[PDB]
Amino acid sequence: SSGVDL
Amino acid sequence: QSMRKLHFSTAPPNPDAPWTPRVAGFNKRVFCAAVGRLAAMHARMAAVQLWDMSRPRTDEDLNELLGITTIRVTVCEGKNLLQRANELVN
Protein backbone atom coordinates (compact mmCIF):
# COMPACT_ATOMS: atom_id res chain seq x y z
CA SER A 1 0.00 0.00 0.00
CA SER A 2 1.09 3.58 -0.72
CA GLY A 3 -0.01 7.20 -1.03
CA VAL A 4 1.44 10.06 -3.07
CA ASP A 5 0.59 13.49 -4.46
CA LEU A 6 0.74 13.93 -8.25
CA GLN B 1 -16.08 2.63 15.82
CA SER B 2 -12.78 3.16 14.00
CA MET B 3 -11.12 2.26 17.27
CA ARG B 4 -12.50 -1.26 16.90
CA LYS B 5 -10.11 -4.09 16.15
CA LEU B 6 -11.28 -5.66 12.88
CA HIS B 7 -11.72 -9.41 12.63
CA PHE B 8 -13.74 -11.68 10.36
CA SER B 9 -16.37 -13.85 12.03
CA THR B 10 -15.24 -16.93 13.92
CA ALA B 11 -18.72 -18.43 13.58
CA PRO B 12 -18.12 -20.55 10.44
CA PRO B 13 -17.00 -24.02 11.65
CA ASN B 14 -14.47 -24.68 8.87
CA PRO B 15 -12.98 -22.87 5.83
CA ASP B 16 -15.52 -24.34 3.39
CA ALA B 17 -18.61 -23.84 5.52
CA PRO B 18 -21.29 -21.65 3.92
CA TRP B 19 -21.76 -18.35 5.72
CA THR B 20 -25.11 -17.47 7.17
CA PRO B 21 -26.55 -14.16 5.91
CA ARG B 22 -25.61 -12.60 9.27
CA VAL B 23 -21.98 -13.68 8.94
CA ALA B 24 -21.77 -12.57 5.29
CA GLY B 25 -23.08 -9.12 6.20
CA PHE B 26 -20.70 -8.89 9.16
CA ASN B 27 -17.66 -9.87 7.12
CA LYS B 28 -18.60 -7.43 4.35
CA ARG B 29 -18.62 -4.56 6.81
CA VAL B 30 -15.26 -5.63 8.26
CA PHE B 31 -13.64 -5.93 4.79
CA CYS B 32 -14.85 -2.51 3.67
CA ALA B 33 -13.89 -0.92 6.99
CA ALA B 34 -10.32 -2.21 6.77
CA VAL B 35 -9.89 -1.01 3.21
CA GLY B 36 -11.30 2.40 4.17
CA ARG B 37 -8.99 2.76 7.18
CA LEU B 38 -5.87 1.93 5.23
CA ALA B 39 -6.86 4.27 2.42
CA ALA B 40 -7.49 7.09 4.92
CA MET B 41 -4.12 6.50 6.59
CA HIS B 42 -2.14 6.52 3.35
CA ALA B 43 -4.00 9.54 2.00
CA ARG B 44 -3.37 11.51 5.20
CA MET B 45 0.32 10.61 5.00
CA ALA B 46 0.42 11.93 1.44
CA ALA B 47 -1.46 15.06 2.51
CA VAL B 48 1.02 15.68 5.33
CA GLN B 49 3.86 15.39 2.81
CA LEU B 50 2.23 17.77 0.36
CA TRP B 51 1.38 20.24 3.14
CA ASP B 52 4.91 20.15 4.58
CA MET B 53 6.47 20.79 1.16
CA SER B 54 4.10 23.70 0.47
CA ARG B 55 4.14 25.22 3.96
CA PRO B 56 1.03 27.35 3.41
CA ARG B 57 0.96 30.35 5.76
CA THR B 58 -1.98 32.44 4.45
CA ASP B 59 -5.56 31.78 3.32
CA GLU B 60 -4.41 32.66 -0.17
CA ASP B 61 -1.65 30.03 0.03
CA LEU B 62 -4.23 27.52 1.11
CA ASN B 63 -6.58 28.38 -1.75
CA GLU B 64 -3.68 27.71 -4.11
CA LEU B 65 -2.77 24.43 -2.44
CA LEU B 66 -6.37 23.18 -2.64
CA GLY B 67 -6.27 23.76 -6.39
CA ILE B 68 -3.33 21.41 -6.88
CA THR B 69 -4.17 18.72 -4.36
CA THR B 70 -4.43 15.39 -6.19
CA ILE B 71 -3.69 12.51 -3.89
CA ARG B 72 -3.56 8.94 -5.20
CA VAL B 73 -3.40 5.98 -2.86
CA THR B 74 -3.48 2.21 -3.28
CA VAL B 75 -4.55 -0.40 -0.74
CA CYS B 76 -2.82 -3.71 -1.40
CA GLU B 77 -2.12 -5.80 1.68
CA GLY B 78 -3.17 -9.30 0.64
CA LYS B 79 -3.81 -11.69 3.53
CA ASN B 80 -2.48 -9.10 5.98
CA LEU B 81 -5.32 -6.63 5.31
CA LEU B 82 -6.91 -6.70 8.79
CA GLN B 83 -3.61 -6.90 10.67
CA ARG B 84 -2.34 -3.82 8.84
CA ALA B 85 -5.59 -1.93 9.41
CA ASN B 86 -5.51 -2.75 13.13
CA GLU B 87 -1.88 -1.63 13.49
CA LEU B 88 -2.86 1.92 12.52
CA VAL B 89 -2.75 4.75 15.05
CA ASN B 90 -4.93 7.91 14.90
Residue numbers in the entry:
A (entry chain B): 8 to 13
B (entry chain A): 21 to 110
Task: Copy text verbatim from the article accompanying this structure deposition.
VP22 is a highly abundant tegument protein in HSV-1 that has been suggested, based on sequence analysis, to be unique to the alphaherpesviruses. VP22 has been suggested to be important for the secondary tegumentation of the virion and the accurate localization of several important herpesviral proteins, including the transcription activating protein VP16, the outer capsid protein VP26, the interesting E3 ubiquitin ligase ICP0, the major transcriptional regulatory protein ICP4 and the essential multifunctional ICP27. Sequence analysis and secondary structure predictions reveal that VP22 consists of a non-conserved N-terminal domain and a conserved C-terminal domain with the clear presence of secondary structures.
Each asymmetrical unit consists of a molecule of VP22core, with visual electron density for residues 174–260, together with three amino acids from the N-terminal purification tag. The structure of VP22core is constituted by a long central α-helix (α1) flanked by a long random coil (L1) at the N terminus, two shorter α-helices (α2 and α3) and one β-strand (β1) at the C terminus. The dimeric state of VP22core has been proposed previously and our light-scattering results show that VP22core is mono-dispersed with a mean molar mass of ~26 500 g mol−1. On the peak side, the dimerization of β1 creates a flat plateau where two conserved arginines (Arg242) create a positively charged peak in the middle of a less charged area. Interestingly, we observed a stretch of unaccounted electron density next to β1. We managed to model a six-amino-acid peptide into this density. It corresponds to the sequence SSGSVD, which is a part of the linker region between the N-terminal His6-tag and the TEV protease cleavage site. This peptide is most likely contributed in trans from a neighbouring subunit in the crystal lattice, which is not part of the crystallographic dimer. Although sequence homology of VP22 has only been established within the alphaherpesviruses, the crystal structure reveals that it shares extensive structural similarity with ORF52 from Murid herpesvirus 68 (MHV-68) (subfamily Gammaherpesvirinae).
